[PDB]
């Protein structure tokens, strides 16, 4: 009485119909660049797992981002280095430009390009409709090609997508928590910041995929749209899927749990209690309205789901309505 077991949709064989050294990353050999062509600047951030710093590269006079690494096993480093590289030239993938070795920490140093991105309070007190329509199909874009490169990024979230929005440019980074798909395969579900946790992490469902992407990018589009961010604001793992289930009801919640047999503490229903599926529009109001429209409304509606096999991909939601402007923007000559 385990659960069901699950599989992608989409690009389900994409890792078994490469050559091993394409997703074997424990059998990477680094090669290092020169530590010294690169000089600190200004420190933008402390995380867990690094600390990141603007930088120069003194033999060209260009910006740079440095990700100096905490230290940690090989294993995990050579992981995010390997789908760096895969994924280097994608579209909106932030590009690895070198590795190093700080003369200091001794640890690996991720050199990256420089993204001048937009102070975030200036961003929300501006943003348009088609702002959001058009970084929403960027965002889109580099999922799509991720996912069909066979690797799940795992930490979607506003402080993982850097916008330059005087250059309408977006780079998808932080890959510290990315991992290649295989199908059948039990992963781990302490992934992704907890407000953009899919409910497959929070039911503890192990045998997930690439859609997690997908719901993580529909709590961005929510938060986007309504002007709330976080959109479900729990105050642990437990509570976000209670902010959730105020939301989407418990009906489909359980009619989930269900489907997957999966199994919950008797405590955790309790918390759960008995909700109402909500209509999107109670989240509408006059300060949020010029960005709603019946179409950003139906896209949330098929990114926002419980079972993770029904939400839409990458590709079928670049091809919604919501996006049509978007498209024919892009359509160009050249
Ligand atoms: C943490 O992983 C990454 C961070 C960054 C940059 N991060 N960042 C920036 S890029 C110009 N600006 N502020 C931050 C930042 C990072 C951590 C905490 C706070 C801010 C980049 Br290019 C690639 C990464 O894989
Ligand atoms: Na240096």
């Given at each position: 009485s385990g659960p069901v077991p699950s599989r992608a949709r989409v690009y389900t064989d994409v890792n078994t119909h490469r050559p091993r050294e394409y997703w074997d990353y424990e059998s990477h050999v680094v090669e290092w660049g020169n530590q010294d062509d690169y000089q600190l600047v200004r420190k933008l951030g402390r995380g867990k797992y690094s600390e990141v710093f603007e930088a120069i590269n003194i033999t060209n006079n260009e910006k740079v981002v440095v990700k100096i690494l905490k230290p940690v096993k090989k294993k995990k480093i050579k992981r995010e280095i390997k789908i760096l590289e895969n994924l280097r030239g994608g579209p909106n993938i932030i590009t690895l430009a070198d590795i190093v070795k700080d003369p200091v920490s001794r640890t690996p140093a991720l050199v990256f390009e420089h993204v001048n991105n937009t102070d975030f309070k200036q961003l929300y007190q501006t943003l348009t409709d088609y702002d959001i329509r058009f970084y929403m199909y960027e965002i889109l874009k580099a999922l799509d090609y991720c996912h069909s490169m066979?690797?799940?990024?795992?930490?979607?979230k506003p402080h993982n997508v850097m916008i330059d929005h005087e250059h309408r440019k977006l780079r998808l980074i932080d890959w510290g928590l990315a991992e290649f798909y295989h199908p059948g395969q039990e992963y781990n579900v302490?992934?992704?910041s907890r407000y953009f946790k899919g409910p497959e992490l929070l039911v503890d469902?192990?045998?997930?995929?690439?859609?997690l992407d997908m719901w993580s990018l529909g709590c961005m589009l929510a938060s986007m749209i309504f002007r709330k961010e976080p959109f479900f604001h729990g105050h642990d793992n437990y509570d976000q899927l209670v902010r959730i289930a105020k939301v989407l009801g418990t009906e489909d919640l359980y009619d989930y749990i269900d489907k997957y047999n999966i199994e919950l503490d008797p405590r955790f229903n309790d918390i759960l209690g008995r909700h109402s599926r909500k209509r999107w529009e109670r989240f509408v109001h006059s300060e949020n309205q010029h960005l709603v429209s019946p179409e950003a409304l139906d896209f949330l509606d098929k990114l926002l789901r419980y079972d993770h096999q029904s939400r839409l991909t990458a590709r079928e939601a670049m091809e919604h309505p919501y996006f049509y402007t978007v498209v024919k923007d892009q359509a160009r000559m050249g």
């Open positions: 066979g690797i799940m990024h795992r930490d979607v302490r992934v992704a469902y192990q045998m997930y995929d690439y859609s």
